[PDB]
Each structure stands twice: as C-alpha cells, then as structure tokens.
Amino acid sequence: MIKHRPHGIEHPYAVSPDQRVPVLPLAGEPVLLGVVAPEADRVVCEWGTLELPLSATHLSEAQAKSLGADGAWSVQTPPLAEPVKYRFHAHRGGAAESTEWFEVSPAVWTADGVGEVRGGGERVRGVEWLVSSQGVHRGRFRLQLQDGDRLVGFGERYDALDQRGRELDAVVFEQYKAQGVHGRTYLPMPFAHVVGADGNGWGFHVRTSRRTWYSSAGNELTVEVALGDEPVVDLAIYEGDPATVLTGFLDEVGRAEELPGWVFRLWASGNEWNTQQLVTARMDTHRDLAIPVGAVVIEAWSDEQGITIWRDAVYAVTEDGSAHRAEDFSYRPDGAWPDPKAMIDELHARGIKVILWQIPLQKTEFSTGQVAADAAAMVRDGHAVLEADGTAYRNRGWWFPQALMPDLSVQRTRDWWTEKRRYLVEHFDVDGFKTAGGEHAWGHDLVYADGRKGDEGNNLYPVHYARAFGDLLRSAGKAPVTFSRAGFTGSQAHGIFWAGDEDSTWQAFRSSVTAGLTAASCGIVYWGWDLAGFSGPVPDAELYLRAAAASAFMPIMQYHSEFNHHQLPLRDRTPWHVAETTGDDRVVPLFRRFATLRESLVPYLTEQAARTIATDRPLMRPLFFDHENDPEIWNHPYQYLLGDELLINPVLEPGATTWTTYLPAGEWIDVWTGDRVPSGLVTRDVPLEVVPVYCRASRWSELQPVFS
Ligand SMILES: OC[C@H]1O[C@H](OC[C@H]2O[C@H](O)[C@H](O)[C@@H](O)[C@@H]2O)[C@H](O)[C@@H](O)[C@@H]1O
Numbered sequence: 001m002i003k004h005r006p007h008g009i010e011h012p013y014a015v016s017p018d019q020r021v022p023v024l025p026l027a028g029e030p031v032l033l034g035v036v037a038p039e040a041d042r043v044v045c046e047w048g049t050l051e052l053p054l055s056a057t058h059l060s061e062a063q064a065k066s067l068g069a070d071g072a073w074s075v076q077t078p079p080l081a082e083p084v085k086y087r088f089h090a091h092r093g094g095a096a097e098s099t100e101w102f103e104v105s106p107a108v109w110t111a112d113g114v115g116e117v118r119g120g121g122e123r124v125r126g127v128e129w130l131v132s133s134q135g136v137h138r139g140r141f142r143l144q145l146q147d148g149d150r151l152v153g154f155g156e157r158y159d160a161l162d163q164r165g166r167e168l169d170a171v172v173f174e175q176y177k178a179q180g181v182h183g184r185t186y187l188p189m190p191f192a193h194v195v196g197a198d199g200n201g202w203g204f205h206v207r208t209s210r211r212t213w214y215s216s217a218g219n220e221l222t223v224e225v226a227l228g229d230e231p232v233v234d235l236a237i238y239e240g241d242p243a244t245v246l247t248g249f250l251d252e253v254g255r256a257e258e259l260p261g262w263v264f265r266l267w268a269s270g271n272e273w274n275t276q277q278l279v280t281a282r283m284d285t286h287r288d289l290a291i292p293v294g295a296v297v298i299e300a301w302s303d304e305q306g307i308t309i310w311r312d313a314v315y316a317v318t319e320d321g322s323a324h325r326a327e328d329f330s331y332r333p334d335g336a337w338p339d340p341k342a343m344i345d346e347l348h349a350r351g352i353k354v355i356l357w358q359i360p361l362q363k364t365e366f367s368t369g370q371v372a373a374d375a376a377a378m379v380r381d382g383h384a385v386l387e388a389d390g391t392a393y394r395n396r397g398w399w400f401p402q403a404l405m406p407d408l409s410v411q412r413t414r415d416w417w418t419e420k421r422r423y424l425v426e427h428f429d430v431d432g433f434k435t436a437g438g439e440h441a442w443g444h445d446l447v448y449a450d451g452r453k454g455d456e457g458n459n460l461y462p463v464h465y466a467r468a469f470g471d472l473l474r475s476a477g478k479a480p481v482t483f484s485r486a487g488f489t490g491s492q493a494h495g496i497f498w499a500g501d502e503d504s505t506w507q508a509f510r511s512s513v514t515a516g517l518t519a520a521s522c523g524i525v526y527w528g529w530d531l532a533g534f535s536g537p538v539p540d541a542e543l544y545l546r547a548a549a550a551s552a553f554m555p556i557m558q559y560h561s562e563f564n565h566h567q568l569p570l571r572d573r574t575p576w577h578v579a580e581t582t583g584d585d586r587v588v589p590l591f592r593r594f595a596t597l598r599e600s601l602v603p604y605l606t607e608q609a610a611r612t613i614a615t616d617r618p619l620m621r622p623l624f625f626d627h628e629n630d631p632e633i634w635n636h637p638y639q640y641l642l643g644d645e646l647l648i649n650p651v652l653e654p655g656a657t658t659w660t661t662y663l664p665a666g667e668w669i670d671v672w673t674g675d676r677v678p679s680g681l682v683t684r685d686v687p688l689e690v691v692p693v694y695c696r697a698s699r700w701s702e703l704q705p706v707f708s
Helices: 061-066 242-253 276-288 340-349 370-380 411-419 422-426 461-475 506-521 541-551 575-582 587-615 631-635 697-707
Strands: 032-036 042-047 050-053 072-076 084-092 095-098 102-104 108-110 116-118 124-132 135-144 150-155 167-170 188-195 202-206 212-217 220-226 232-239 267-269 295-298 353-358 432-435 482-484 496-498 527-530 556-558 640-642 646-648 658-663 668-670 680-685 693-696
Touching: 032 042, 032 084, 124 220, 150 167, 150 506, 167 188, 188 242, 202 242, 232 242, 267 276, 267 556, 276 295, 276 340, 340 353, 411 461, 422 461, 432 461, 461 482, 496 556, 506 527, 506 541, 527 556, 541 575, 541 587, 575 587, 587 697, 631 658, 668 697, 693 697
Parallel strands: 116 232, 267 295, 295 353, 353 432, 432 482, 482 496, 496 527
Antiparallel strands: 032 072, 042 050, 042 084, 084 095, 084 102, 108 124, 124 135, 135 220, 150 188, 167 212, 188 202, 202 232, 212 220, 640 646, 646 693, 658 680, 668 693
C-alpha cells in the first residue's frame, strides 16, 4: 500500500511525510514529494515523462511517527517549469501498486491581473497576485509606514506589543505552550493599529477569515492574503486616535456587552478536581483560609465521553441521539458526583459561581453508549463538519483524535449541540462554560453548512463556538459567560478569554501580559491568564506572588493547573498548595491580601468595563491610547492603565528589590503610600506584597478606600 496527500495533514505550521512540499511551488522551485509506504522494496515517481526514484526519508518525532515517518519515501524533483501530472509506483517482492494521478501547477507573482485591492486608498502600493494555471491564489501589497510608527494589533500576541520588523501571520492554531517563542496564537485578527509618531494615527482591517501573512522592513508593511474564487481583497482603513480606530473596527466586527460584575472576582480552578468531594474540599479550604473566590471552574466533571453528562450518572441511552432531560439522570451515593445540585446550591449560597469545561468535539472511539449514538446522529442528520467528499471530518489533531466537529456555523446545529447541555443551565443552574479548543479544523476544502469552505470557515469556528454557548446561557435567562482561549475577528462579542496553556516561568509571565495588552488593543475586554502558569512543577513563591499581585490588577484573575495523571504530590496552583510546596509562609497571607484587595476593586472594574464598552477605550490599556505622541511609552511595553485611573507596572523579573515605572503626563499618586509622585521615571521598593500601582491624582479620593 502507498499513500500520497498533496496538502498532507494540513498542519498550518508543519508538513506531513505523505505530502508535497511546498503544496504550491513557485515556477523555478523544485518540489519535494513525500509518500508513505510502510513495506515496499522500492518506490518510484512517474513525473511528467520522467521517472524519479525515491529514498527512505516541523513535526515532532512522536507526531511524525504516528503519520508514518518510518517507512516514508521522498525525492526532490527538477524545478517546476510547467504543470506536471504525476503518480507513484511501489513494489514489494514483485507485487505492484500505483497511486491515483496527481497534478501540480507552478505559480508566479505578478502585478498584472483582474484582481483588485479595494479600500486602501493612497496608503496601498505594490499590489501583486500569485497566479497559476489554476487561478489567482493570493494577493499581496504594501502599506506605507512613517518613522516612529508602531504596529500594535493582530489579535492576541505573545512575543511583543510592537510587531514592526517582524514576520507573523493570522491563523487560528493551538500552540501548546511557548506561544511567544514560536510567535503563534489561539486568537489572531487581521487587524492592527498603526500608531502615529508623529501625526494622526490609523488602523486597518483585512476583511477575510482566510490566512494572512505580515512582514515589515523599512517604511513598508507587507500584507499577504489567501484568496478564494474571487480575486478581491477588501481592506478597511480607520482614521483617528487609537480609541477611534478601535471604534471603527468594533462597529464593523462586533463589540463586548457588559458582563455581570462577579466575573471580576477571583476564579479558582484545577484540572484534577474530578470529584464532588475534591471540589467541595478545595472551596472549603478557600473559605477556611479566608481567601475570597467568586467562581470555580470544574474541568473534569463529566463522563469524559460526550462531555455533556456528569461522571457516573445513570440514565437510559437515547438511541436517536436526542438530548437528555434532567430527570433522565440518577446519581449514585458512591459515584464521583452523588449530588451535584446540592454542591452547586451550596456554592451559590456562598456566592460562588460554577463554570463547566467544554470541548467542541464528539469522540468517535466508542462503539457504544450515548457518545456513540450522538456521533451516529451527527452524521445522519448532518450536524457534523464535512470533508470535501461529503464524509464527516475527523479530528486530524493529536488531542481528541478522530473526533467529529459539530457544525456550529448554522443555527440548527448550534441548537442541537447546546441542547444537550441545557439541563445543566436550567436545572443545575451553572453560570458559565469554559469553552476550550475550537482550533481543531484542518483542511482547505472542508465544507460548512453555512456554505463556507475550510480555508474560509476554519478560522471562524471558535467564534461560532463561543457564540453558541453564549446563546445557550441567554436562552436560559443568564449572562453569556463563556471562557475561551481561541477566537478570531468577531470574538469580541462573546464572553471571556484567557491566554491558554503555558509553563510556569518568568518568560511565560511576560508573554501573557503582552497577550492581554495586544488583545485589548483589538477589542478583547474581559481577558485573563493562568497566573504563574498551569503546567509543569508548581511555581516558586516569588513567581507565584509576582503573578498573583499583577493579575489582581488585570481584567480576569484566575489560577489553574494542568492534568497531572492524579500523581502525588499534587500540582495544584491553589495558594496553600504553593505554600506547601515552597515551604514559604508568605504565600497564603500575601495572596489573601491581593484577593481581598481585588474584592474591593470590583465596583471600579465594573464601572471601567462599562466605559470601555461605551467608549472603546480599553480596560487593560497600553499607554499609546491616551499618550500616543509620547515617545517614551514604548520603552515600557509591559506597563498599562487599568481603566482610566490606574497605572500598573508588573514585576516581571526574579530577584528585583526595586522597580522603575514611567508615569506619563498628569499628576499621580502612589496608591500604597498615598503620596504624590512626579510624572516621569519613578523608582520604589518592591517587596512581595507590593506591585507598583499609581492613581491619577484627581480620582484618588475615589480609589483611596480600596487601598486603605
Ligand atoms: O477532564 C476534562 C479534560 O481535561 C483535560 O483538558 C483540560 C485542558 O483543556 C484545554 O487544554 C485547556 O486549555 C486547559 O486549560 C485545560 O486544563 C484533558 O486534556 C481532556 O482530555 C479532558 O477531557
């Protein structure tokens, strides 16, 4: 047997051993041809009129092996001067087999074409098109920049606030940690601020959900756009100060709505709280240690099959794949969740909201049960995202492999899919969903029921996903509180976002701050991260407290911990476990101090979030919004305003006993001493109980009780 897929697995940053590299070669380029034939004596390619012998040949070694890296054949062809038809022939001991015919057409960049780039006015130059015998594959063009212009935007970015001088793209991808290092993201947008030095600033939005690439050198920003059947790039330009630029974007693509004030309290989470006993014990420790928590996320709450039913719940399976009613279920005394309603009711009585984990995937690896019935129903009734051949798409990723994706691009399947979760909101009264994932769709030719194809619709999927569960909550009369890592243009209007998975490191800390700042610049209001990281060994006391202090001054303050296989010792990120692991007796008292202060901040946050939604001036706010003509601000990219009145300067290095903050124009006050401070550089002591925070002098009469 022998297999060749020209596009391969269609990992956006990597190639599989079975594919053609590159998929679309430029004229003059050679092409590499991979093939997987685990047992064959010899493998040859019939290439045009020639015959090309294959040898035995960014994926990891574990991932590549699963795709057949062992027993993979490859050969580099002659350069592509024209379209070539080709196939492969493999022999095992005289037994012969041949692949279907494939064809590749080389492409060229040209300024000649019927294609238009519309809307850029006189800012656009150097328009060109990537064309082959198949058609126009990509547009490309240049935006004029001036000296001192910064590029801030592109959704949530982990490497730097200013993207000028960098190569990057916008595509939804799950990068498992180290997002800043690889320069990737779960939440890209083809939008950015061009932040003026000197004169009036502006911004742009490339209107597409397809892939876009970006690079800047000298005075030009180069924008490359993937295309569909129509060779047209629609470009929107927004003129004004940074807030006004954001307004133009958000007026076009959507905007946050006010969420309930309780989302501004501390969120407690850990993945290994997989029983009612554990959740209640963890929240009890919160109560007993007097550490206020406003919400608890339960990730492993479910049967781990369909992920819409409590673990060890007893019910009659519905063969038709219809949704369950609350009364369908029984909960046994000896099960993992003997009385989930009683648990939630008690939590609610304590003022704690309850959030359940979600994934937009239906496991196919079971032949029985509700999970199998629903999977069969998805295919039968057309609720699944489809391949080009009409079969159901199966997850090509390594996380939840082969699972189906519900097609959330249309209302009927959004209804059908969320209907399975309805009893959770209406009976059990859960207050939100942590809607994880959504990046799972890989293929250019995938078909969505809304008429979009994969190259267009795959980036849109996480937006549909958050909206689906936001709508479920609305339909139950509750605020649309969803908690999502993934998104795209339009995500601004659905729920809360966190920065995804990272190790516990100072680098990840710094990356996360950048992620929040860039996200806010694009209109993402309610944002957080897993403070001091959720993955690997427990953070040390210093990193934990530096992160905890700063996060209390961020839109969403939440701690979380990755699945450890239920080993001992625990990897929990709870304050008392950190104290336990580090042996540091300052962790619980100082975290309690931060959490207690955070509670006092809720009315301020609530008011500021309302201003942010009305004026589009960001909640976690880079200084260029108010201060754009101040050149000095760019030397302190980790500083920000929290709402109008508070400037925050996180301590991002270990061992720091002092910290220096740049205060822009206006009068300021040190919130810890109540003293007045002159604008410009300011240095103050930073013991672990302090993160530098300054208040506009005119409103310190309002903020003073908070810090008293
Ligand atoms: O038991 C529920 C769930 O736990 C893990 O998923 C948790 C993980 O989900 C995403 O990676 C989020 O970004 C993280 O914050 C969460 O900790 C397991 O991997 C999964 O199989 C399981 O169903």
